[PDB]
Amino acid sequence: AQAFVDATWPQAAKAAQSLGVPAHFLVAQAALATGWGKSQIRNKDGTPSYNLFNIKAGSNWTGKVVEARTVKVRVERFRAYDSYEQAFQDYADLVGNSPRYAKVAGKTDGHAFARALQEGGYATDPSYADKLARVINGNALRQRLMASAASA
Numbered sequence: 001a002q003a004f005v006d007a008t009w010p011q012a013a014k015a016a017q018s019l020g021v022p023a024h025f026l027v028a029q030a031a032l033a034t035g036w037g038k039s040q041i042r043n044k045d046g047t048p049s050y051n052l053f054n055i056k057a058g059s060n061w062t063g064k065v066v067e068a069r070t071v072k073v074r075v076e077r078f079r080a081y082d083s084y085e086q087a088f089q090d091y092a093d094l095v096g097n098s099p100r101y102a103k104v105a106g107k108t109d110g111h112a113f114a115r116a117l118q119e120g121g122y123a124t125d126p127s128y129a130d131k132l133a134r135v136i137n138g139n140a141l142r143q144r145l146m147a148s149a150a151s152a
Contacts, residue, residue: 004030004037005144008052011088018092020106024145025113026091028135029053041068041078049080050087053122055094095120110136 005027012026030052034040041049049066057065057077064080081087095101101120107113113136114129125131135141146152 001031001036001038001140002144002147004034006148008084008088009148011084015088015092019096019104021104021113022108024141025107025110025136026088027145028110028141029117029132031141032132032135041066041080043080049078050084051079051081052084052087053091055079055090 008027008030009023012030013023016023016026031037033054034052037052041051041054043049043066049064051066055078057063057079061079064082066078066080067075068078070076079090081090095104095117098120101116101122103116103119104113107116111129111133114132117123117132118128122128
């Protein structure tokens with residue numbers, strides 16, 4: 001999981017700073033969405049989609065599209081990107097500009113941030129806020145963030 005954390009960190013920091021939330025909030029969200037990078041959506045050619053937030057491709061999406069199986073088993077259409085950099089740019093646009101996500105900005109508490117994501121419709125599972133806050137506040141994330149840092 002460490003390389004996942006290291007790779008996402010600078011992009012998460014860039015996006016989180018624009019949203020006025022702590023960088024680790026976004027890292028935690030991506031970690032929960034992908035099982036710390038173990039379960040990420042892949043293109044048919046074997047390349048990554050880099051869609052670490054598992055964002056669906058709807059009618060307003062004109063970029064690359066990847067199909068992936070969801071659990072009956074269904075085929076869902078997801079966004080695909082050229083890098084984590086581009087993925088986080090799209091995330092920052094979506095969460096930063098969409099009015100339903102307006103409660104996200106400025107949040108400095110893990111659970112409050114998660115509740116704001118839920119309000120916006122990121123995920124509808126009733127346990128989402130509790131699950132995400134646990135990652136945000138957890139020892140696993142803290143240890144990996146400390147390991148990631150250049151200094152102590």
